[PDB]
Amino acid sequence: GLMQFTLPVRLCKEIELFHFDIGPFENMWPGIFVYMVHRSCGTSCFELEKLCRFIMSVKKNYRRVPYHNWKHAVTVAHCMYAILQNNHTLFTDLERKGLLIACLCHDLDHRGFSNSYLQKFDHPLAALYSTSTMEQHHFSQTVSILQLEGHNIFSTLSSSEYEQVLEIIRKAIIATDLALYFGNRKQLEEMYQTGSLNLNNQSHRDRVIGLMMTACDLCSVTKLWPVTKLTANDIYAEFWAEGDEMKKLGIQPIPMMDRDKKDEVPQGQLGFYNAVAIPCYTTLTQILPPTEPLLKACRDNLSQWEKVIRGEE
Ligand SMILES: CN(C)c1nc(CC[C@H]2CCN(c3ccccn3)C2)nc2ccc(Cl)cc12
Ligand SMILES: [Mg+2]
Ligand SMILES: [Zn+2]
């Protein structure tokens, strides 16, 4: 009740900034998350014992893969925390509750392989869920953990409020399928530019939350350059293992998954920043002006990849 979480001074200040890195001490990550829920949502949002039990079962259901691991989950939740704290009055009580949970759960039980690889392997999940294959699995694992004894963090919500928060979570998790982002951002671009964007329209709020989810999921491109560059190593460790598995199925992988083509990483990152990252944070900054530091840090990192190519690093 009167039991606040407090962080050391450096973390207490820097956790408020978009570019915060949660650090290599895994045992501090639960406390960092609870800290963020208490300031973002309130100390009354969740029963501490249930929230702590939920966080630890979530952790246990992330795998020891190079990138789509527990550290990614907490990192994506912190980017959402920073967006929510910079946009105090724009979000509902239920949205504040739902979105940090959605971010912590958005990659539950990821194996380090894309939807394409599951479909080419003919994995059972690809027959259960024909599109957004891993994202439907991540939502299925979130409902499983919510239903374990002593893990219903939403127990005090009415039936209809409980259904609404699980619907915010389902949409926020599905929206992390990058295949869905391209069309979502185009519609948001048209809506903002013809002045039709309306934050009282539920279907429009859903689009804006979807874009927030892409922005938080891609937030490694918005860190300080040494964090961005070292994270890229983990991202490629997975891509290249997937390429190896494609080659075992007798399929030449695309170049971003082929370790024989490491030399092309700098130009590949360039395309990604130009086609995905910069557009994402540009549209987000137009809808939510106080998120501009994400766009600025992305532009800084695009310019670092240009330097890599020019042989200045
Ligand atoms: C979101 N996710 C799919 C991401 N995909 C890529 C790959 C771009 C790829 C486009 C081309 N590609 C190549 C091509 C040849 C050799 C090497 N790479 C990289 N880079 C990312 C970086 C940061 C984050 Cl946070 C997410 C991603
Ligand atoms: Mg994912
Ligand atoms: Zn993710």
Least distant ligand from the CA of 181? 1
Q: From the CA of 139, which ligand is nearest?
A: 2
**CA–centroid distance, residue 55 to ligand 1 (Å):** 29
Pocket test for ligand 1, best of 115, 267, 272, 308 (most atoms within 8 A of CB): 272
Experiment used for this model: X-ray
Contacts for 38-47 with beta carbons within 8 Å, 24 or more apart?
A: 38/4, 38/5, 39/81, 39/85, 40/81, 40/84, 40/85, 40/96, 40/100, 41/96, 41/97, 41/100, 43/1, 43/4, 45/96, 45/97, 46/97, 46/153, 47/153, 47/155
The verdict on whether 151 is a catalytic residue reads: no
Q: Identity (one letter) of the amino acid at 234?
A: D
Select from 225, 235, 254, 260 the residue to mutate for testing ligand 1; criterion: most ligand atoms less than 8 Å from CB: 235
The verdict on whether residue 107 carries a ligand-binding annotation is: yes
Ligand 1, atom 9: closest residue by C-alpha: 268
CA distances from 123 to 118, 120, 309 (A): 5, 8, 38
Nearest CA to ligand 1 atom 26: 218
Burial environment of residue 217 by CB neighbours within 10 A (0 to 12, 13 to 18, 19 or more): buried
How many CB atoms are closer than 10 A to CB 237? 14
Would you say the C-alpha torsion 225, 226, 232, 234 has a positive or negative sign? negative
d(CA 282, CA 284): 5
* Candidates 68, 137, 138, 151; catalytic one: 68
Does the annotation list 38 as a binding residue?
no
78 contacts 22 by C-beta, under 8 angstroms: yes
* 269 assigned ligand-binding residue: yes
Instruction: Judge whether 72 is annotated as a binding position.
Output: yes
Distance (Å) of CA 155 to CA 58, 159, 165, 262, 274: 18, 9, 12, 49, 44
Asked whether 180 lines ligand 1 (CB < 6 A), one says: no
Nearest to 58 by CA among 103, 97, 92: 103
Q: What tokens were used for 221? A: 């491109």
What domains can be seen in the chain, in order of their start residue? Answer: 28-310 (1.10.1300.10)
Q: Are 76 and 103 spatial neighbours (Cβ–Cβ below 8 Å)?
A: yes
The CB of 256 under 6 Å from ligand 1? The reply is yes
Give the amino acid at 120. K
**CA 21, chain centre distance (Å):** 14
Alpha carbon distance 154, 158 (integer Å): 9
